[PDB]
Design a binder for this molecule. Structure first.
Ligand SMILES: NC(=O)C1=CN([C@@H]2O[C@H](COP(=O)(O)OP(=O)(O)OC[C@H]3O[C@@H](n4cnc5c(N)ncnc54)[C@H](OP(=O)(O)O)[C@@H]3O)[C@@H](O)[C@H]2O)C=CC1
Ligand SMILES: CCCCCCCCCCCCCC(=O)SCCNC(=O)CCNC(=O)[C@@H](O)C(C)(C)COP(=O)(O)O
Ligand code: SF4
Ligand code: SF4
Ligand code: SF4
Ligand code: SF4
Lengths: 112, 93, 364, 44, 340, 112, 208, 176, 145, 96, 118
């Protein structure tokens, strides 16, 4: 199939690393500009966590699309198009912890 | 009517039980209850007598009522009842 | 991006009014999707109904009755007066001229009860439906419309007295937001945004719909492409609407206001309560609705803000599969940066107003 | 009989739809002369 | 009798069966208790003696019909009856740090608690959550802590199976502890008895206290237990205030003020018919070191791990900074020395 | 001479006939660079020859505009420029070649 | 048929559109796959997805096709196809007073050449197609969210995207900000099964 | 078939040039606009003395919903549920059971005025003129919950506005 | 069919017949398609339903006041195209367009009949047969229904 | 309007027109708010004979779009339509 | 294999815990029409629908409770389910058997098909 930006996973992994460097070097500015009440480590760990969620992906086309969406998210953060509400949406705080144990799920509700 | 808790009952029979927290919404406020139970109001209407074997009721007013329906009056034990209006008709016996 | 007050870059961020109309339409029947178009351009409501009605009728392969078409045009131009009053006065209000806003909005109030007396709603009448209109004109409505349109010319002339020859208004609009004819076509501009640059194109003349081929009116054409010329076009379009309204008030034909096809348009309540066939169809049309034959169409009309088009896709059921809405202001706002090059901050305020943008249609 | 809302027989009256911004004031010569005369009277 | 089966996913439109009457919900802790109750889908009943305007901020905390507002009088048991009649949980947060004209520490920390506890038994309320103060002593130097101890015994007498919570010094965005010290900059220096070297405080975050109350209601074993909500670190008063003036980037000028002089200053600020800036009992309570009660369960037993002050102090004191030090992060200021 | 073309951004050309002849000759050359059997070459050559013959036939500007039915003569010049650019682009695109690929099975079937 | 209820049919425009469709198909056989003229006189040309730029540039610049105005640019999601997304181009020819349609197809991954170089209006239309459906347009000057929220995840106008979405907003007093939470509805959207079990139009009957 | 706005060259006669210079220097058009708004000053204002004076309305006005009853006193609603089916906002919720008499009577008829689009489709679909958007438009509430109307609320509304609702129906039913 | 009526006369009316506590009968809607009669006589073996009279006065139903007692009587509600025979328990409760259809399996007996559970707003409104040629064809028992 | 002659003259002079003629406020020329009952006419299909729906079913006379060319198994150049006729200047007010 | 799950934006709970069913809807027994039993449909699994305390309306927290996708063939539905990582459950389409019907059998001479009434 026709590629999007890369023809090999190695080429696709290169763009992921480039995005990570841009994201990693942006977190100190994001905390400073948005006046976040978190630490630089928390944001950088959060960036790592979101990258690690899409770690099982093997199709280079999907990898390119994820980086394309990754750059779009970074542009909003750099340009302060996002707000403190948008930035802190990754750090789910109002959401109560949902246990993943069967017995805990059994006690709560009919959730399969 | 009035429920045992002291709460007026609606025409649908709904009335919050004493063991129901939802009754607290009526604490400093009122419970909106219509005082014109339709089931009581229609039964008050008399049963019209028509010599014909089949009559038609439109609810009164023509186009301001309901679709016209025709009612059989053969059963002497009961009275033909309009589906929409609820009015009763009886063939003289 | 401002260098002092010079606009280096103009980046429009939209979607703050994106309500997902096009997705919500897919879950509702063709009749239920009609009120959605009233809210797209909430300054010109009945025009949006007409565009949707024409698209459905084109797919339905039916024809509205002759009287309904004249009512669609009479209220189509009354709708145009509503929009151009809003378009011009609020444009002047943002410039700084606050007085003409109140003068014309009293006339805008008189036209609002024309909506209310014929439908029961001041703005969202949901009156123009596929197959004609909903109800016939109440007795004495045509006379009152004549009385309003008789004196409305003076209101426009009073508006021109305050703006047309005012040197301050000309300084704020002349040579502001100049759009070349070639750029306007490529950027997708339509309506006044085209005819303000000299392009001779009106969808009521070239591609007439309803009875727009039986009315006589003049298409105002600009010469410089600036805000001032488009201001003159909209003012003249209001005058030309009165020319059309007078013809509609004298050429109104007798007849029914719905296509006499009870499988598309609901039967009369008198027929519904007496006829078995009428009750069945009334029952089905208001629960499932009419099935539209499979196919797709792009029907566009000359809305007050430009070309308003609807790309309707039908899968054969009673609910539209896809309903893409072409907002005339969607393309106009896309060229805001192109038009606001080398202009100050105060000029962008003028340029936004002259494009006649309502974000309901932009953010469908 | 049919009693729709219809235009009166013969139609409605004529509706004005053109600009009628009138011509007002004096000519430039007259206004300038009046101004200069007022200036001269004030000077004297 | 009023037993409700929880339904949903614990969200805004869910049902939790936690129908509650939060007395004094129009206050620092109240807001958070109501918000935690509201987000779970609980029928929260909010009694109020203030103007409905002051209760407006509680309205968006719950879904439609989940937040009922009804007036109450602390000196009228009948008004208490109609607000706890259909509640399976009653939470008492009524408490003022200053004696008023018509209400004294005895009336707010003894009479009202007893009335709430007594009436709740009459209406059949299952669970009651009373909020005392860590340093509640029957012979405390402060009348505030004195009444806080008398009322604690009376609640257990009126309501034998009632959960009693003794928070240390709750700190938060609308707090009168962190903001209290940060607002002393307007008076020049920072008057501290013995320069704040003879006082140890263990403040608690507002969110942790609120979640502890909610977890206490959810926990079936909290009935009759006495909890003590404290923070994870103990600070000297001088070290804590210096850290407060550190993240606030204010010049810290501490001067030792003798106890009699500080009490005299506190008396002067009591003249204000509005909310006093400080009180004699406020001075004594601040100077009083926090008690340590290892024989009582805390936040840890309820599953909530206490949040260190360092992590949540930037939120409170950011508004107290000038334009120069608004965008500074929360990591530049080093944590103060903890006496642990 | 014409004072203005009416359209904004379109300037009056003092030499319309010469410009039209030059543009049409260039278009004809570019089409001559295209294979004969291609339909684009045949159709465009026919149109260009008709227009060039009409230009050579009539020296009057207004009569030429009426005969061309392309609007004002400046619009005709712009159309000729666009046609020349299109021919140059189609020289690279080569659309006379067979279809790139057939639609996959039921790709244009409606309804579903 | 005839009489007022039916819509009149114009054969002249039908013949003209069919002739022009044959013309376009002859000129551009490399990309044109199918040509149709609907009964209400609307011309559709079906183009292989690689033919976006060539066919559109031809329809814009050709002397016999001056579709210099991009009326609309939308996508249709048909999840029953390999290429579910169907990109539709609506053009207007002010010179000949007619309109034409160009339809291509694309997957959830295969990009489409951006027609910004052809029509400058295609910019925001392609941005909206990307935002609503997920179709990526290569060589696009600025592709980003145009209509959805800034931190929005998912493409809503897809047929498999839920009507109410997955997340909802509200103001939390604890965090002093608007927070996104999983969607919970006080009343569920009552889905209606409205299709009649009887065939309505025999002329569109698909083979068994 | 088209008109040229602007596109009007000025005469360069010395009299015309002098008139234009006088307009520029003495601000003639500014005084003209000043006179226009001064004339508007002495007009009669179009304000109405609300709430003592109310704006014009029509019998077709779509306002607060209400469930009407037959002259006999019984509800017209026979729970056909097509008013709920046609409602484009899905604001109507209907549950019905065979009443003690055996008739089709709703047990729940709930309309959230906070979701309704005041389209009228409900009153137009009802085959017995039961649900009818009445003439009331001033029913603003201080809380959201009051706008979630019950069957009792609608029935009560109908009984209150019946006189007017009937009169409006009688005035307008010939157009429907 | 057409979209309007030319019938300017008065419609007929038929006295309702009580045939049991399950099938609500409004015989004015009967179109005399004789589906119920054939279904009884063949699938149910109960030769109780029939037509009495002739011409426009022909009426379907038992001549005497008899109850149509059968374990498969419930299917005459489904076969009947018009609403002449309707489910008395399901009467007036819901409309077809709003009900959500869940295809399930019957457990009342060991036949394992295929049924459709019509739910609306989280509540079972009715049970309808689901076609399975090898198990229950098109019918379900009265208990299952 | 209830305006004195002096006020009316001042208003007319300041406006420069006769305002008392085309007053914006409505006094009596409006239609009556209680109109007589109407009687709307029936459509063209309200007849008892020669009115079978098959002869007037526009919705069912639509057809699937006609395929003109499918890739699946000297002509003159053809325009989409005749070139648009040049518009003609208005004869009421050719130049505003 | 297509793994567009990371691009659809669906949360993890509604990708793995879900159970998509692929089936041709059964004919509504109340009608003889079969037009609805011609296209394959895809629906999710029913989840909790509790009662709203204020009004009694049936609330839900399932965003996919109203998704009904229609496919032309079974293979397309299976492919679409595999694209988004949904655990599909295909049910084979059931077509009514061809049945031998004879009006003359109603009046059989030596067979049980002889009817007693018409
Ligand atoms: N750090 C702290 O604040 C700590 C506090 N506590 C205790 O725990 C509780 C926490 O509440 P907190 O957030 O401090 O509250 P606030 O001091 O912020 O507000 C007091 C609340 O109690 C109500 N209230 C006070 N006095 C009366 C009265 N006489 N009659 C009626 N209502 C009254 C107020 O209602 P209104 O606003 O209308 O007057 C308001 O809701 C209090 O009892 C407090 O003493 C214990 C340990 C630490
Ligand atoms: C403030 C907090 C901001 C958080 C936002 C962070 C983001 O924007 S995450 C978007 C980035 N997503 C990606 O890069 C997807 C990468 N796709 C992949 O397939 C990769 O995981 C690779 C190619 C397998 C490589 O990853 P691994 O090294 O195998 O693991
Ligand atoms: S109000 Fe009318 S339409 Fe609605 S359920 Fe009742 S009878 Fe039917
Ligand atoms: S007015 Fe419209 S939206 Fe409101 S209840 Fe009636 S049909 Fe529904
Ligand atoms: S099945 Fe119904 S319509 Fe047919 S004969 Fe029996 S009762 Fe009449
Ligand atoms: S729903 Fe069917 S059976 Fe009932 S009255 Fe209407 S047509 Fe007759």
């Amino acid at each position: 199939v026709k590629p999007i930006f890369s023809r090999d996973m190695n080429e696709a992994k290169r763009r992921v690393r480039e995005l990570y460097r841009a994201w990693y070097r942006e977190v100190p500015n994001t905390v400073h500009l948005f006046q976040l009440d978190i630490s630089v480590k928390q944001g950088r760990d959060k960036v790592r966590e979101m990258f690690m969620k899409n770690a099982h992906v093997t199709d280079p086309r999907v990898v390119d699309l994820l980086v394309i969406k990754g750059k779009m998210e970074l542009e909003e953060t750099i340009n302060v198009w996002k707000q403190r509400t948008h930035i802190m949406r990754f750090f789910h705080e109002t959401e109560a912890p949902r246990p993943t144990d069967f017995l805990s799920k059994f006690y709560v509700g009919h959730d399969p | 009517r009035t429920s045992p808790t002291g709460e007026k009952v609606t025409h649908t029979g709904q009335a919050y039980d004493d063991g129901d927290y939802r009754r607290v919404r009526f604490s400093d406020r009122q419970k909106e209850v219509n005082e014109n139970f339709a089931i009581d109001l229609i039964a008050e209407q008399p049963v019209s007598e028509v010599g014909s074997r089949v009559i038609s009721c439109d609810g009164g007013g023509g186009a301001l009522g309901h679709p016209r329906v025709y009612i059989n009056l053969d059963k002497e034990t009961k009275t033909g009842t309009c589906g929409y209006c609820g009015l009763q008709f009886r063939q003289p016996h | 991006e401002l260098s002092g007050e010079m606009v280096r870059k103009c980046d429009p961020h939209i979607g703050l009014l994106h309500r997902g109309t096009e997705k919500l339409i897919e879950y509702k029947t063709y009749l239920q999707a009609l009120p959605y178009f009233d809210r797209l351009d909430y300054v010109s409501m009945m025009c949006n109904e007409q565009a949707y009605s024409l698209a459905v009728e084109k797919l339905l392969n039916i024809q509205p009755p002759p009287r309904a078409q004249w009512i669609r045009v009479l209220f189509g131009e009354i709708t145009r007066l509503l929009n151009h009053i809003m378009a011009v006065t609020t444009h002047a209000l943002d410039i700084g001229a606050m007085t003409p806003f109140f003068w014309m909005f009293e006339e805008r109030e008189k036209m609002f009860e024309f909506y209310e007396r014929v439908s029961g709603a001041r703005m969202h009448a949901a009156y123009i439906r596929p197959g004609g209109v909903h109800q016939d004109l109440p007795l004495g409505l045509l006379d009152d419309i004549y009385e309003f349109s008789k004196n409305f010319s003076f209101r426009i002339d009073e508006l021109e007295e305050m703006l047309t020859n005012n040197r301050i208004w000309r300084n704020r609009t002349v040579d502001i937001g100049v759009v070349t004819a070639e750029d306007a076509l490529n950027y997708g501009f339509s309506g006044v945004m085209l005819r303000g640059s000299g392009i001779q194109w009106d969808l009521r003349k070239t591609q007439p719909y309803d009875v727009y081929d039986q009315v006589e009116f003049d298409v105002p054409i600009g010469s410089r492409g600036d805000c001032y010329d488009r201001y003159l076009c909209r003012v003249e379009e209001m005058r030309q609407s009165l020319r059309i309204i007078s013809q509609c008030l004298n050429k109104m034909p007798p007849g029914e206001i719905k296509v006499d096809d009870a499988k598309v348009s609901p039967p009369k309540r008198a027929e519904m309560k007496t006829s078995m066939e009428s009750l069945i169809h009334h029952f089905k049309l208001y629960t499932e609705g009419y099935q539209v034959p499979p196919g797709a169409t792009y029907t566009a009309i000359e809305a007050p803000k430009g070309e308003f088009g609807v790309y309707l896709v039908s899968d054969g059921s009673s609910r539209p599969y896809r309903c893409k809405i072409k907002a005339p202001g969607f393309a106009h706002l896309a060229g805001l940066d192109k038009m606001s090059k080398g202009h100050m901050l105060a000029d962008v305020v003028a340029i936004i107003g002259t494009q006649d943008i309502v974000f309901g249609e932009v953010d469908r | 009989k049919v009693k729709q809302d219809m235009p009166p027989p013969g139609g409605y009256g004529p509706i004005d739809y053109k600009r009628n911004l009138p011509r007002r004031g004096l000519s430039g010569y007259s206004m300038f002369a009046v101004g200069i005369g007022t200036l001269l009277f004030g000077y004297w | 009798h009023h037993a409700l089966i929880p339904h949903g996913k614990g969200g805004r439109s869910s049902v939790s069966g936690i129908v509650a009457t939060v007395f004094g919900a129009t206050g620092f802790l109240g807001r958070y208790v109501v918000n935690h109750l509201g987000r779970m889908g609980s029928q929260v009943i909010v009694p109020y003696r203030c103007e409905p305007y002051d209760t407006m901020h509680l309205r968006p905390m719950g879904d439609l019909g989940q937040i009922i507002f009804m007036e109450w009088n602390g000196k009228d048991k009948d008004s208490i009856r109609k607000v706890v009649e259909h509640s399976n949980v009653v939470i008492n947060l009524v408490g003022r740090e200053w004696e008023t004209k018509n209400f004294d520490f005895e009336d707010v920390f003894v009479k009202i608690p007893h009335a709430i506890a007594q009436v709740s038994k009459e209406a059949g309320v299952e669970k009651l959550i009373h909020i005392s103060h860590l340093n509640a002593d029957i012979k405390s130097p402060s009348r505030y802590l004195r009444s806080k101890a008398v009322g604690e015994k009376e609640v257990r007498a009126a309501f034998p199976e009632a959960t009693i919570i003794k928070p240390s010094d709750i700190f938060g965005r609308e707090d009168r502890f962190l903001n209290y010290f940060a607002s002393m900059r307007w008076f020049g220096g920072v008057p501290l008895i013995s320069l704040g070297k003879e006082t140890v405080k263990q403040p608690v975050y507002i969110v942790d206290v609120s979640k502890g109350i909610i977890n206490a209601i959810k926990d079936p074993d909290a009935k009759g237990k006495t909890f003590a909500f404290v923070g994870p670190n103990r600070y000297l008063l001088f070290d804590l205030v210096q850290y407060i003036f550190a993240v606030a980037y204010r010049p810290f000028l501490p001067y030792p003020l003798p106890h009699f002089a500080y009490r005299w200053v506190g008396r002067l600020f009591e003249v204000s018919p509005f909310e006093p800036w400080t009180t004699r009992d406020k001075v004594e309570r601040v100077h009083m070191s926090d008690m340590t009660l290892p024989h009582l369960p805390g936040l840890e037993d309820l599953g909530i791990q206490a949040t260190p002050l360092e992590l949540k102090a930037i939120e409170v004191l950011r508004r107290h900074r000038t334009y120069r030090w608004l965008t500074s992060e929360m990591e530049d200021v080093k944590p103060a020395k903890t006496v642990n | 001479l014409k004072k203005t073309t009416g359209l904004v951004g379109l300037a009056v050309c003092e030499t319309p006939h010469e410009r039209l002849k030059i543009l049409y000759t260039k278009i004809l050359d570019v089409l001559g660079q295209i294979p004969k059997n291609a339909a684009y070459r045949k159709y465009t050559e026919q149109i260009t020859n008709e227009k060039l013959g009409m230009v050579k036939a009539e020296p009057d500007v207004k009569k030429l505009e009426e005969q061309l039915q392309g609007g004002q003569i400046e619009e005709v010049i712009l159309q000729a420029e666009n046609e020349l650019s299109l021919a140059r682009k189609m020289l690279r695109w080569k659309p006379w070649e067979p279809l790139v690929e057939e639609p996959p099975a039921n790709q244009w079937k409606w309804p579903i | 048929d005839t009489r007022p209820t039916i819509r009149p049919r114009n054969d002249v425009v039908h013949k003209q559109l069919s002739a022009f469709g044959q013309y376009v198909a002859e000129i551009l056989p490399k990309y044109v796959q199918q040509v149709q003229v609907s009964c209400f006189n609307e011309l559709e040309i079906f183009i292989h997805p690689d033919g976006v730029i060539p066919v559109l540039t031809f329809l814009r610049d050709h002397t016999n096709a001056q579709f210099k105005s991009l009326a609309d640019l939308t996508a249709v999601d048909v999840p029953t196809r390999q290429n579910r997304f169907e990109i539709v181009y609506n053009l207007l020819s002010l010179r000949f007073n007619s309109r034409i349609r160009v339809k291509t197809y694309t997957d959830e991954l295969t990009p489409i050449e951006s027609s910004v170089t052809v029509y400058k209006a295609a910019n925001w239309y392609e941005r909206e197609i990307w935002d609503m459906f997920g179709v990526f347009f290569a060589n696009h000057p600025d592709l980003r969210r145009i209509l959805t929220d800034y931190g929005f995840e998912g493409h809503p106008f897809r047929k498999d995207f839920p009507l109410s979405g997955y997340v909802e907003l509200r103001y939390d007093d604890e965090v002093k900000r608007v927070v996104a939470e999983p969607v919970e509805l006080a009343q569920e959207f009552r889905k209606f099964d409205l299709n009649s079990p009887w065939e309505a139009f025999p002329a569109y009957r698909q083979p068994p | 078939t088209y008109k040229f706005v602007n596109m009007r060259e000025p005469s360069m006669d010395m009299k015309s040039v002098t008139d234009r210079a006088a307009q520029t220097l003495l601000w003639t058009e500014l005084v003209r606009g000043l006179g226009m708004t001064l004339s508007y000053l002495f007009r009669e204002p179009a304000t109405i003395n609300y709430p003592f004076e109310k704006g014009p309305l029509s019998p077709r006005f779509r306002g607060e919903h209400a469930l009407r009853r037959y002259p006999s006193g019984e509800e017209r609603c026979i729970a056909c549920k097509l008013c709920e089916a046609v409602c484009p906002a899905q604001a109507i919720t209907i549950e019905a059971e065979p009443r003690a008499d055996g008739s089709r009577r709703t047990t729940r008829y709930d309309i959230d005025m906070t979701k309704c689009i005041y389209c009228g489709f409900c009153q137009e679909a009802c085959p017995v003129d039961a649900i009818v958007e009445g003439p009331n438009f001033e029913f603003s509430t201080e809380t959201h919950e009051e706008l979630l109307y019950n069957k009792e609320k609608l029935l009560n509304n109908g009984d209150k506005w019946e006189a007017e609702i009937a009169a409006n129906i009688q005035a307008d039913y010939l157009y429907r | 069919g057409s979209d309007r009526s030319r019938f300017l006369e008065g419609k007929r009316a038929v006295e309702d017949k009580n045939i049991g506590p399950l099938v609500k009968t409004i015989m004015t809607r009967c179109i005399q398609c004789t589906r119920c009669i054939r279904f009884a006589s063949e699938i149910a073996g109960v030769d109780d339903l029939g037509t009495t009279g002739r011409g426009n006065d022909m009426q379907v139903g038992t001549y005497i006041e008899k109850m149509f007692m059968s374990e498969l009587s419930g299917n005459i509600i489904d076969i009947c195209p018009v609403g002449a025979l309707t489910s008395k328990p399901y009467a007036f409760t819901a409309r077809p367009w709003e009900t959500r259809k869940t295809e399930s399996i019957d457990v009342m007996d060991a036949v394992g009949s295929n049924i459709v559970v019509s739910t609306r707003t989280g509540e079972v409104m009715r049970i309808l047969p689901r076609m399975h040629e090898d198990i229950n064809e098109e019918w379900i028992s009265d208990k299952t229904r | 309007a209830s305006a004195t002659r002096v006020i009316q003259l001042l208003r007319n002079w300041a406006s420069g027109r006769d305002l008392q003629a085309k007053l914006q406020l409505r006094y009596q020329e409006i239609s009556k708010r209680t109109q007589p009952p109407p009687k709307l006419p029936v459509g063209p299909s309200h007849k008892l004979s020669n009115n079978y729906y098959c002869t007037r079913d526009g919705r069912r006379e639509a057809m699937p779009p006609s395929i003109v060319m499918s890739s699946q198994k000297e002509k003159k150049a053809v325009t989409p339509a005749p070139p648009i006729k040049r518009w003609e200047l208005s004869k009421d007010q050719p130049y505003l | 294999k297509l793994d567009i799950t990371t691009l659809t934006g669906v949360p993890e709970e509604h990708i793995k815990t879900r159970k998509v069913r692929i089936f041709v809807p059964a004919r509504n027994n109340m009608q003889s029409g079969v037009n609805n039993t011609k296209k394959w449909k895809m629906e999710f699994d029913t989840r909790e629908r509790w009662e709203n305390p204020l009004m009694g309306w049936s609330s839900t927290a399932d965003p996919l409770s109203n998704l009904v996708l229609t496919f032309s063939t079974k293979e397309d539905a299976v492919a679409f389910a595999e694209k988004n990582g949904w655990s599909f459950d295909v049910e084979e389409r059931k077509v009514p058997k061809p049945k031998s019907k004879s009006y003359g059998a109603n009046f059989s001479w030596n067979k049980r098909t002889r009817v007693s009434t018409k």
